Amino acid sequence: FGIIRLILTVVPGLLIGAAISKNIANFLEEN
Amino acid sequence: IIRLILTVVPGLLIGAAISKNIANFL
Amino acid sequence: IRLILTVVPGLLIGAAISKNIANFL
Amino acid sequence: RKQRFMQFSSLEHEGEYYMTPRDFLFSVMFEQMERKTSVKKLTKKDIEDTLSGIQTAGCGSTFFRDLGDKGLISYTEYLFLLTILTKPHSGFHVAFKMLDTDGNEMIEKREFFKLQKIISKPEINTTLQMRFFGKRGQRKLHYKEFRRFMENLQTEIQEMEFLQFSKGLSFMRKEDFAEWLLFFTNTENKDIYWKNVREKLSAGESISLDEFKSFCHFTTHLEDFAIAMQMFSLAHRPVRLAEFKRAVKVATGQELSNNILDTVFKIFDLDGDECLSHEEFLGVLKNRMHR
Amino acid sequence: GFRDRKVMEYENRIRAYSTPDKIFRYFATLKVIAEVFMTPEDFVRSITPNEKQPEHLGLDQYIIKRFEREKFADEGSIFYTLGECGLISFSDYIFLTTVLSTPQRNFEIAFKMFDLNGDGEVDMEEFEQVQSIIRSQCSALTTYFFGADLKGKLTIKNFLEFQRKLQHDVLKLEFERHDPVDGRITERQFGGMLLAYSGVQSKKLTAMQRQLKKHFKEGKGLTFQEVENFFTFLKNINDVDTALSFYHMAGASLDKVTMQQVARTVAKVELSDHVCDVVFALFDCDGNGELSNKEFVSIMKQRLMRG
Amino acid sequence: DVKTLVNQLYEALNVREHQLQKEVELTTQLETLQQELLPLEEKKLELEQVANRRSNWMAWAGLGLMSVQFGILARLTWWEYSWDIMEPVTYFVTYGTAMAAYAYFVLTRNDVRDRQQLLLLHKKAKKTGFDVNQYNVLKDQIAKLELDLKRLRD
Amino acid sequence: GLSDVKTLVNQLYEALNVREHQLQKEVELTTQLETLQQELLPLEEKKLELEQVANRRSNWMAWAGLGLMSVQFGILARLTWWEYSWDIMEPVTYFVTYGTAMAAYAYFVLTREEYILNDVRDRQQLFDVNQYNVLKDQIAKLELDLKRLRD
Amino acid sequence: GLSDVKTLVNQLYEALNVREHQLQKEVELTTQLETLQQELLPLEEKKLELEQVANRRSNWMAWAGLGLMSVQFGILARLTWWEYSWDIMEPVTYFVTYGTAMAAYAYFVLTREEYILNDVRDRQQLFDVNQYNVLKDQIAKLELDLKRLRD
Amino acid sequence: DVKTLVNQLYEALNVREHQLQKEVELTTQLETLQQELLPLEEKKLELEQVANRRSNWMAWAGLGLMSVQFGILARLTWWEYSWDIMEPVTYFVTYGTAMAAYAYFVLTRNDVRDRQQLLLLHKKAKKTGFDVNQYNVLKDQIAKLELDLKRLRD
Ligand SMILES: [Ca+2]
């Protein structure tokens, strides 16, 4: 029953990291 | 040590064969 | 003193052993 | 250098020091004066008379020797000779280009002073000015005469060195050549070199003035020798006497004799092998060239 | 443009410190069927810093090409004699990049050493020795320098002429990579070419633009011939530096006429007014026409030696 | 001498019906002890749960942060940049993450293991109402009494 | 306190009543020690059984961890040295090492959280070690006293 | 053994002489608690002093280790991104990290060996924690008896 | 009645000279108990020093093997090969070293911490002549006696 929460914790963190790198690189190229 | 080898070596060979099969499948 | 006397001989032995093993190979 | 000027100057006029050609030669050969003679204080008329009885001297390689004590050197002039002795000649040619363009490169009496002041970094008549421009500055200095004069200076000082080591024997002995070679290098390694040469010289062999002149020329060209030895070291082959002769032929552009070059390879054969210890060789030749 | 600056700095680090193989696999842009190749433009890019690689090609990604074939170098160009239709393979890349760098005195000495009673005689084995020694400190060119019999002797004159032609062709490529119009380069672009191997900072170049603006010099252009004459002039930088220091200590001012006089006298090259104007625009002390001989010699030395 | 006197004393006070009296006194002292113990036990349980939630939350947050770093690095070296330009950045980010974990450690600081855990919990608390040593001697007294009761029942 | 003094009087009467105070007490000590050890036996058996049952599990789990680590090593070694070169598979091995460290951490976190939540739930809803240890205390003290009385 | 039964009789006598059985006994228990605590205080002083003098050392040592590691981090980053390239500074950083780890483990093993040698030597040549501990336990039992007597 | 009986018995047996008698009996009981404890402490010291020698030796061997491996890697990475060919070998050698360290750590297996350590050493080594339990109970009894003697000396 723990694996569901394990996935629900990891995968959103990983996706958030991807989107944050997207946005930070965009900002840096902008300014 | 005999059981240590009998645990490690088959795992490594199984990993090698699995890498073979996975690269072929991909 | 014992720290150096343990490390340095081990390192030199490793160097010589790699030399000899590479020659043999 | 100026210390040497004040130590060896033997004429004086109006609180100003002056050298004779004999003084100048003894200055270029030695560090200290042999006889601590007082500086004779001479007057205007007398210092003019010192240069009256000249032009009796042969304008070849005996120029300075023939002038003897009958000559005058301003401190600046003495600096200009020293650079000619130590420096390679090509730099002076560059100055001849810079001074005058599309011309014979003539200099006035004042321009001669300018040349001295730049290279080594009214007035009385002097031997150089009178020789080069005539008595009253009528002729002009064409580069080739200066090149000939510099060659004659080199040759004369070299002949003087050969006589001074020969002691008037008209030929040398290779131990004396070794002495001339290692002389200036005062850093203590000379004992082992002396041992090696004495073992490997085989007394009774001789060299004449032409060999000595050719080896001094090689001394002046030494840099190409260093590049060739470095290239051999990168090749990682031990340099051998024949290879040393090949490097000498490349550097100097001349073919030295077997005996002289074999002697030099033997002396600087620091190890028992047949390989030139060229590092110390270069060091010794550098010391020798800088005097 | 942040990412572009980061990529260009990374490329400069590759050029300056990486192994001669990484520089090849990274700057090569062709793959012929399997062997990698670099068009001559890529060879020029691999030596001049601050040049950007095309986005997609980069490292270990090439334009795979299928085996009259297309010509990548103009007829008569030296790269054409490499053997391909003007393409450079790694084997030739090392050879060309070691012929570009080493000074001609070393080649003279090496040729003089390994030979038999000959000033400029060399054979293939002796040539291999020379290459090894000089690289410490060639495909399809054997016919060019030795003949079909492969026993001809390369006279040092022929090899030095070949090296000179190589430098000339690389210079023409480096010039053309600046997009000339009517055959004239922008003063700022000539400043870049001159300072390309110098300090990274572009401040002085800006100051040059302001100087030319307030001097009516920007906007006249330099032909390729003028740049060639200027580099042949720089090919005597040692004697030029000695003569400059001499004229400096003599008391004369390092003005434009002094630089053209010294150029004529010690380099046998006729400089144009504009070229002296530009050298002075980016090399004066602050405003004055006196030249900063020391820094000038420094930068010109570190530029002529290709780094 | 004193033997018959202590015999008379035993006859007087120790009526010798003391076996069942011991049984009933034991089986009620046990209940009184348990009732005296329960508050200490509930305090201990509350303290344990309150010190458990913190570590659970912190561990899950640490895993979330590791995953976020993974995502940031995998989105840099495969879409925006290349791997080779982002090799030292990843090495130094890993070094910095290990250093930050070490700094977190330095800033935050069978049955015998439980005793040590309870001692550390009491020390970190300074929370009155739960006196660990009183609870320990109390549990020990209860265990001894219950064992004696098991002997009595046989 | 009447019960306390009653038990005290009983104790004093029993102590004075004994004959061969140094002999008969040694006998009663042996009997009591034997009886207490015979009482301790079931607790020790239960403890040993539970220890073995909770130890073989961890042994098998660590063995499985080693097997999985070796399998991963084999996969990486074959891919790096047979199929694709190392230059193309440097990022894959770095990120797989990262994934493996994260999975190890996740297993530790899962086992800790599950065990502690189960323990707290069982404690809130509810082999007693305390009486076993108290029995060890009583029996060691009895054996020590017997030792002192014998020699 | 006669002295033991005499002490039992003395306990009985102290029990029987009581007036205001539960009150004066509560008072005596209060005096006992006060006495035991006044005695306990010096041991707690010794213990807290030793604890602080053993805690500050580890704190400063860990700070020093972290500072050294940060210095190495900065040096390697500056040599990698400004002076040289990463292509040329990969083996240097790998072997510097290896050396740092080996030095940390060597320091750990050396302090362990020195500590165990010194401890065994001092034990062979020779704050009594156990009288502090039995003092804590006795005073707790007494406070518990006082509580039970209160209500 | 019975109170006067136990008072007469107090005068009879409890001579009341037992204060100084108790002092001298205690100052001798303490020596007796320490003389009893001594062999147990000797056995404990011997066992712990023998189990400490082994740990020291094994940790020294570990450091030696670490240094030998570092040596071999450095020599190859700078003399016999280039770094390019020795990156995968370096990574896989580090992986193998980690796997070996884990196989070793799997094949091997505040006063309460010391008590747990002693209990574990006794359970593992299980040598007769030393019982941790009797040693603990004797330590606590002699401690309580020292304490009573301090209270008596005042
Ligand atoms: Ca790498």
Side-chain angles (χ1 to χ4, degrees), chain H residues 91-112:
Chain H
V92 155
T93 187
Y94 164 78
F95 279 93
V96 157
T97 290
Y98 205 121
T100 279
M102 200 166 63
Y105 176 77
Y107 159 81
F108 273 178
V109 70
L110 203 43
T111 197
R112 276 297 164 75

PDB file of all heavy atoms in Angstrom, chain H residues 91-113, unseen atoms left out:
ATOM      1  N   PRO H  91      40.468  13.522 -13.519  1.00  0.00           N
ATOM      2  CA  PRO H  91      41.176  12.608 -12.614  1.00  0.00           C
ATOM      3  C   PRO H  91      41.681  13.296 -11.368  1.00  0.00           C
ATOM      4  O   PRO H  91      41.748  12.667 -10.305  1.00  0.00           O
ATOM      5  CB  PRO H  91      42.329  12.085 -13.479  1.00  0.00           C
ATOM      6  CG  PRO H  91      42.548  13.150 -14.465  1.00  0.00           C
ATOM      7  CD  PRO H  91      41.184  13.644 -14.800  1.00  0.00           C
ATOM      8  N   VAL H  92      42.001  14.586 -11.453  1.00  0.00           N
ATOM      9  CA  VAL H  92      42.509  15.291 -10.284  1.00  0.00           C
ATOM     10  C   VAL H  92      41.432  15.365  -9.213  1.00  0.00           C
ATOM     11  O   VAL H  92      41.679  15.069  -8.040  1.00  0.00           O
ATOM     12  CB  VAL H  92      43.017  16.687 -10.675  1.00  0.00           C
ATOM     13  CG1 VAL H  92      42.970  17.616  -9.484  1.00  0.00           C
ATOM     14  CG2 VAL H  92      44.431  16.592 -11.216  1.00  0.00           C
ATOM     15  N   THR H  93      40.212  15.739  -9.606  1.00  0.00           N
ATOM     16  CA  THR H  93      39.130  15.817  -8.630  1.00  0.00           C
ATOM     17  C   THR H  93      38.765  14.436  -8.105  1.00  0.00           C
ATOM     18  O   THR H  93      38.499  14.280  -6.907  1.00  0.00           O
ATOM     19  CB  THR H  93      37.910  16.539  -9.199  1.00  0.00           C
ATOM     20  OG1 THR H  93      36.950  16.727  -8.155  1.00  0.00           O
ATOM     21  CG2 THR H  93      37.260  15.762 -10.307  1.00  0.00           C
ATOM     22  N   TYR H  94      38.735  13.419  -8.973  1.00  0.00           N
ATOM     23  CA  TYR H  94      38.402  12.084  -8.485  1.00  0.00           C
ATOM     24  C   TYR H  94      39.405  11.622  -7.436  1.00  0.00           C
ATOM     25  O   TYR H  94      39.022  11.109  -6.377  1.00  0.00           O
ATOM     26  CB  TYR H  94      38.343  11.083  -9.633  1.00  0.00           C
ATOM     27  CG  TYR H  94      38.399   9.658  -9.144  1.00  0.00           C
ATOM     28  CD1 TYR H  94      37.284   9.048  -8.601  1.00  0.00           C
ATOM     29  CD2 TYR H  94      39.572   8.929  -9.207  1.00  0.00           C
ATOM     30  CE1 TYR H  94      37.333   7.749  -8.144  1.00  0.00           C
ATOM     31  CE2 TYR H  94      39.629   7.632  -8.750  1.00  0.00           C
ATOM     32  CZ  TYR H  94      38.508   7.048  -8.222  1.00  0.00           C
ATOM     33  OH  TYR H  94      38.564   5.755  -7.769  1.00  0.00           O
ATOM     34  N   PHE H  95      40.698  11.811  -7.699  1.00  0.00           N
ATOM     35  CA  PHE H  95      41.694  11.322  -6.757  1.00  0.00           C
ATOM     36  C   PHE H  95      41.775  12.197  -5.517  1.00  0.00           C
ATOM     37  O   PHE H  95      42.113  11.698  -4.443  1.00  0.00           O
ATOM     38  CB  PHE H  95      43.056  11.203  -7.433  1.00  0.00           C
ATOM     39  CG  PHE H  95      43.209   9.948  -8.234  1.00  0.00           C
ATOM     40  CD1 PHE H  95      42.923   9.936  -9.582  1.00  0.00           C
ATOM     41  CD2 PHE H  95      43.623   8.779  -7.639  1.00  0.00           C
ATOM     42  CE1 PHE H  95      43.052   8.783 -10.318  1.00  0.00           C
ATOM     43  CE2 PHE H  95      43.752   7.625  -8.372  1.00  0.00           C
ATOM     44  CZ  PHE H  95      43.467   7.629  -9.714  1.00  0.00           C
ATOM     45  N   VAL H  96      41.433  13.480  -5.623  1.00  0.00           N
ATOM     46  CA  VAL H  96      41.386  14.321  -4.432  1.00  0.00           C
ATOM     47  C   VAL H  96      40.232  13.900  -3.531  1.00  0.00           C
ATOM     48  O   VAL H  96      40.365  13.866  -2.302  1.00  0.00           O
ATOM     49  CB  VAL H  96      41.286  15.802  -4.834  1.00  0.00           C
ATOM     50  CG1 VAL H  96      40.691  16.623  -3.712  1.00  0.00           C
ATOM     51  CG2 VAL H  96      42.652  16.333  -5.205  1.00  0.00           C
ATOM     52  N   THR H  97      39.089  13.545  -4.122  1.00  0.00           N
ATOM     53  CA  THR H  97      37.981  13.038  -3.320  1.00  0.00           C
ATOM     54  C   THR H  97      38.336  11.704  -2.674  1.00  0.00           C
ATOM     55  O   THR H  97      38.034  11.476  -1.496  1.00  0.00           O
ATOM     56  CB  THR H  97      36.733  12.905  -4.187  1.00  0.00           C
ATOM     57  OG1 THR H  97      36.254  14.210  -4.528  1.00  0.00           O
ATOM     58  CG2 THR H  97      35.647  12.152  -3.455  1.00  0.00           C
ATOM     59  N   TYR H  98      38.976  10.812  -3.433  1.00  0.00           N
ATOM     60  CA  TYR H  98      39.469   9.560  -2.864  1.00  0.00           C
ATOM     61  C   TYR H  98      40.392   9.816  -1.680  1.00  0.00           C
ATOM     62  O   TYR H  98      40.277   9.167  -0.635  1.00  0.00           O
ATOM     63  CB  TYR H  98      40.195   8.760  -3.941  1.00  0.00           C
ATOM     64  CG  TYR H  98      40.248   7.272  -3.708  1.00  0.00           C
ATOM     65  CD1 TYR H  98      39.716   6.392  -4.633  1.00  0.00           C
ATOM     66  CD2 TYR H  98      40.853   6.748  -2.581  1.00  0.00           C
ATOM     67  CE1 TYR H  98      39.771   5.032  -4.434  1.00  0.00           C
ATOM     68  CE2 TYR H  98      40.912   5.391  -2.373  1.00  0.00           C
ATOM     69  CZ  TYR H  98      40.369   4.538  -3.303  1.00  0.00           C
ATOM     70  OH  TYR H  98      40.424   3.181  -3.102  1.00  0.00           O
ATOM     71  N   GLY H  99      41.327  10.752  -1.832  1.00  0.00           N
ATOM     72  CA  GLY H  99      42.249  11.045  -0.750  1.00  0.00           C
ATOM     73  C   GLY H  99      41.557  11.614   0.471  1.00  0.00           C
ATOM     74  O   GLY H  99      41.893  11.264   1.602  1.00  0.00           O
ATOM     75  N   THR H 100      40.577  12.491   0.262  1.00  0.00           N
ATOM     76  CA  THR H 100      39.844  13.047   1.394  1.00  0.00           C
ATOM     77  C   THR H 100      39.080  11.960   2.141  1.00  0.00           C
ATOM     78  O   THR H 100      39.095  11.917   3.378  1.00  0.00           O
ATOM     79  CB  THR H 100      38.897  14.148   0.918  1.00  0.00           C
ATOM     80  OG1 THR H 100      39.631  15.365   0.739  1.00  0.00           O
ATOM     81  CG2 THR H 100      37.785  14.380   1.928  1.00  0.00           C
ATOM     82  N   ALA H 101      38.417  11.063   1.408  1.00  0.00           N
ATOM     83  CA  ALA H 101      37.688   9.982   2.064  1.00  0.00           C
ATOM     84  C   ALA H 101      38.632   9.058   2.821  1.00  0.00           C
ATOM     85  O   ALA H 101      38.348   8.659   3.959  1.00  0.00           O
ATOM     86  CB  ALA H 101      36.876   9.195   1.037  1.00  0.00           C
ATOM     87  N   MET H 102      39.762   8.704   2.206  1.00  0.00           N
ATOM     88  CA  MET H 102      40.724   7.839   2.875  1.00  0.00           C
ATOM     89  C   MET H 102      41.283   8.503   4.125  1.00  0.00           C
ATOM     90  O   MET H 102      41.491   7.842   5.147  1.00  0.00           O
ATOM     91  CB  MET H 102      41.851   7.463   1.917  1.00  0.00           C
ATOM     92  CG  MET H 102      42.614   6.223   2.327  1.00  0.00           C
ATOM     93  SD  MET H 102      43.641   5.572   0.999  1.00  0.00           S
ATOM     94  CE  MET H 102      44.771   6.939   0.761  1.00  0.00           C
ATOM     95  N   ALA H 103      41.506   9.817   4.075  1.00  0.00           N
ATOM     96  CA  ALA H 103      42.033  10.521   5.238  1.00  0.00           C
ATOM     97  C   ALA H 103      41.000  10.588   6.354  1.00  0.00           C
ATOM     98  O   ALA H 103      41.347  10.464   7.533  1.00  0.00           O
ATOM     99  CB  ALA H 103      42.491  11.922   4.841  1.00  0.00           C
ATOM    100  N   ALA H 104      39.729  10.788   6.008  1.00  0.00           N
ATOM    101  CA  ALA H 104      38.688  10.787   7.031  1.00  0.00           C
ATOM    102  C   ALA H 104      38.590   9.425   7.708  1.00  0.00           C
ATOM    103  O   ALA H 104      38.518   9.334   8.942  1.00  0.00           O
ATOM    104  CB  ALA H 104      37.346  11.181   6.416  1.00  0.00           C
ATOM    105  N   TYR H 105      38.597   8.348   6.917  1.00  0.00           N
ATOM    106  CA  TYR H 105      38.530   7.018   7.520  1.00  0.00           C
ATOM    107  C   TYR H 105      39.775   6.709   8.342  1.00  0.00           C
ATOM    108  O   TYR H 105      39.682   6.037   9.375  1.00  0.00           O
ATOM    109  CB  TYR H 105      38.339   5.952   6.441  1.00  0.00           C
ATOM    110  CG  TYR H 105      38.354   4.534   6.969  1.00  0.00           C
ATOM    111  CD1 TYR H 105      37.248   4.007   7.625  1.00  0.00           C
ATOM    112  CD2 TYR H 105      39.472   3.728   6.812  1.00  0.00           C
ATOM    113  CE1 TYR H 105      37.258   2.712   8.109  1.00  0.00           C
ATOM    114  CE2 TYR H 105      39.489   2.431   7.292  1.00  0.00           C
ATOM    115  CZ  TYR H 105      38.381   1.929   7.941  1.00  0.00           C
ATOM    116  OH  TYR H 105      38.394   0.640   8.423  1.00  0.00           O
ATOM    117  N   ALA H 106      40.941   7.195   7.912  1.00  0.00           N
ATOM    118  CA  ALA H 106      42.155   6.989   8.695  1.00  0.00           C
ATOM    119  C   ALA H 106      42.102   7.744  10.014  1.00  0.00           C
ATOM    120  O   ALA H 106      42.526   7.221  11.048  1.00  0.00           O
ATOM    121  CB  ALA H 106      43.380   7.412   7.888  1.00  0.00           C
ATOM    122  N   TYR H 107      41.587   8.974  10.004  1.00  0.00           N
ATOM    123  CA  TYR H 107      41.412   9.698  11.258  1.00  0.00           C
ATOM    124  C   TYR H 107      40.460   8.960  12.188  1.00  0.00           C
ATOM    125  O   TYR H 107      40.710   8.863  13.397  1.00  0.00           O
ATOM    126  CB  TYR H 107      40.906  11.114  10.987  1.00  0.00           C
ATOM    127  CG  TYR H 107      40.236  11.757  12.178  1.00  0.00           C
ATOM    128  CD1 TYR H 107      40.987  12.350  13.183  1.00  0.00           C
ATOM    129  CD2 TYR H 107      38.852  11.777  12.296  1.00  0.00           C
ATOM    130  CE1 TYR H 107      40.382  12.939  14.273  1.00  0.00           C
ATOM    131  CE2 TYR H 107      38.238  12.361  13.384  1.00  0.00           C
ATOM    132  CZ  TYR H 107      39.008  12.943  14.369  1.00  0.00           C
ATOM    133  OH  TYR H 107      38.400  13.530  15.455  1.00  0.00           O
ATOM    134  N   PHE H 108      39.357   8.438  11.644  1.00  0.00           N
ATOM    135  CA  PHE H 108      38.408   7.701  12.474  1.00  0.00           C
ATOM    136  C   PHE H 108      39.060   6.472  13.096  1.00  0.00           C
ATOM    137  O   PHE H 108      38.955   6.247  14.309  1.00  0.00           O
ATOM    138  CB  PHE H 108      37.180   7.311  11.655  1.00  0.00           C
ATOM    139  CG  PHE H 108      36.119   8.370  11.628  1.00  0.00           C
ATOM    140  CD1 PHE H 108      34.957   8.191  10.898  1.00  0.00           C
ATOM    141  CD2 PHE H 108      36.279   9.544  12.344  1.00  0.00           C
ATOM    142  CE1 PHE H 108      33.978   9.166  10.878  1.00  0.00           C
ATOM    143  CE2 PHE H 108      35.306  10.521  12.328  1.00  0.00           C
ATOM    144  CZ  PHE H 108      34.153  10.333  11.594  1.00  0.00           C
ATOM    145  N   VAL H 109      39.739   5.661  12.281  1.00  0.00           N
ATOM    146  CA  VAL H 109      40.362   4.456  12.821  1.00  0.00           C
ATOM    147  C   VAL H 109      41.455   4.810  13.818  1.00  0.00           C
ATOM    148  O   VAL H 109      41.651   4.101  14.810  1.00  0.00           O
ATOM    149  CB  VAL H 109      40.894   3.551  11.691  1.00  0.00           C
ATOM    150  CG1 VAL H 109      42.098   4.164  11.011  1.00  0.00           C
ATOM    151  CG2 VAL H 109      41.279   2.214  12.259  1.00  0.00           C
ATOM    152  N   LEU H 110      42.163   5.923  13.601  1.00  0.00           N
ATOM    153  CA  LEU H 110      43.252   6.278  14.503  1.00  0.00           C
ATOM    154  C   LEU H 110      42.716   6.742  15.847  1.00  0.00           C
ATOM    155  O   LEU H 110      43.240   6.351  16.897  1.00  0.00           O
ATOM    156  CB  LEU H 110      44.131   7.354  13.872  1.00  0.00           C
ATOM    157  CG  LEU H 110      45.555   7.434  14.422  1.00  0.00           C
ATOM    158  CD1 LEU H 110      46.135   6.039  14.591  1.00  0.00           C
ATOM    159  CD2 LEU H 110      46.432   8.275  13.513  1.00  0.00           C
ATOM    160  N   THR H 111      41.674   7.577  15.841  1.00  0.00           N
ATOM    161  CA  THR H 111      41.092   7.986  17.111  1.00  0.00           C
ATOM    162  C   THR H 111      40.462   6.797  17.827  1.00  0.00           C
ATOM    163  O   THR H 111      40.551   6.707  19.055  1.00  0.00           O
ATOM    164  CB  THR H 111      40.081   9.123  16.910  1.00  0.00           C
ATOM    165  OG1 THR H 111      39.832   9.766  18.166  1.00  0.00           O
ATOM    166  CG2 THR H 111      38.762   8.620  16.349  1.00  0.00           C
ATOM    167  N   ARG H 112      39.880   5.850  17.082  1.00  0.00           N
ATOM    168  CA  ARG H 112      39.330   4.651  17.706  1.00  0.00           C
ATOM    169  C   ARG H 112      40.422   3.831  18.379  1.00  0.00           C
ATOM    170  O   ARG H 112      40.281   3.419  19.536  1.00  0.00           O
ATOM    171  CB  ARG H 112      38.587   3.810  16.673  1.00  0.00           C
ATOM    172  CG  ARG H 112      37.162   4.251  16.432  1.00  0.00           C
ATOM    173  CD  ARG H 112      36.327   4.096  17.689  1.00  0.00           C
ATOM    174  NE  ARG H 112      35.074   4.841  17.611  1.00  0.00           N
ATOM    175  CZ  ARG H 112      34.026   4.466  16.885  1.00  0.00           C
ATOM    176  NH1 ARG H 112      34.070   3.346  16.176  1.00  0.00           N
ATOM    177  NH2 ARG H 112      32.927   5.208  16.874  1.00  0.00           N
ATOM    178  N   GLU H 113      41.513   3.567  17.656  1.00  0.00           N
ATOM    179  CA  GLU H 113      42.607   2.776  18.211  1.00  0.00           C
ATOM    180  C   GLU H 113      43.218   3.457  19.429  1.00  0.00           C
ATOM    181  O   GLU H 113      43.473   2.811  20.451  1.00  0.00           O
ATOM    182  CB  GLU H 113      43.672   2.533  17.142  1.00  0.00           C
TER     183      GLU H 113
END
